């Protein structure tokens, strides 16, 4: 400000869990603390095991589409294999019922 200085307004607190890994997914991109996660440990950026807080950036999703599309296609084949298993059993049962 105009009085020729910088003053502290506050300190963003960061939280680490025992497991981070175990958090309960909520809202928008919100997580609830859980027993699995354990109790949050508070600290500041660059202290202990708390990473840094550079401004000028957003993290963005860690999803890799080059691998998700693959996963999907494979999964679809697997899915159909299960479907045949059911049909197989159904056909068989119908066979039994009608051979009498």
């Amino acid at each position: 400000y105009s009085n020729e200085q910088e003053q502290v307004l506050g300190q963003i607190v960061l939280a680490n869990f025992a497991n981070n890994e175990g958090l309960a997914s909520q809202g928008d991109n919100v997580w609830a603390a859980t027993q699995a996660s354990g109790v949050a440990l508070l600290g500041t950026a660059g202290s202990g095991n708390f990473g840094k807080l550079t401004n000028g950036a957003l993290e963005a999703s860690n999803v890799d589409l080059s691998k998700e599309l693959v996963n999907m296609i494979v999964a679809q084949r697997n899915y159909q294999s299960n479907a045949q298993t059911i049909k197989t059993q159904d056909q068989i049962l119908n066979t039994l019922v009608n051979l009498r």
Binding site: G51, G56, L58, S61
Partner: protein, 151 residues
């Protein structure tokens, strides 16, 4: 004995949708990829009965940093979550680096939850690290003049 196929079928369906959400939400911020474990079901036979059950997990790897510059676009590296407070007095955690000052002079996401931190006190203000994680606000009111004390 249809259950020995149906169980699996259902598990597969779940898997597909987990993947589907990873794909869709790949355009979101701070989103961590989800997946699921699977396990064998029921004994009492040499042959597995029922067959399969799913356990969903989420892998919190770091994302990227994205050359932004508007608002209080604070990214975070490694472990760490921002501590947020819902207006109803509830504590939440998030890696949602998007922050903006609202009309009340409060830092929030969108979402809408309050970003917390340590309170500042004194003149110039100092950070009470041992204090409770108070809501961060930014007043637009004036720095009072301070007499020379020493020189």
């Amino acid at each position: 004995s249809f259950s020995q196929a149906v169980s699996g079928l259902n598990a597969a369906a779940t898997n597909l949708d987990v993947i589907g959400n990873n794909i869709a939400n790949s355009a979101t911020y701070g989103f961590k990829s989800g997946t699921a474990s699977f396990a064998d079901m029921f004994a009492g036979s040499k042959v597995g009965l029922g067959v399969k059950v799913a356990g969903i997990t989420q892998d919190f790897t770091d994302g990227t940093t994205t050359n932004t510059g508007r608002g209080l676009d604070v990214a975070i590296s490694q472990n760490g979550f921002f501590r947020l407070v819902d207006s109803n007095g509830s504590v939440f955690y998030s890696r949602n680096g998007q922050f903006k000052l609202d009309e009340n002079r409060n830092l929030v996401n969108m979402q809408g939850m309050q970003l917390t931190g340590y309170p500042a006190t004194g003149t110039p203000p100092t950070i009470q690290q041992g204090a409770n994680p108070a809501p961060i606000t930014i007043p637009n009111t004036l720095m009072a003049a301070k007499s020379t004390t020493t020189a």
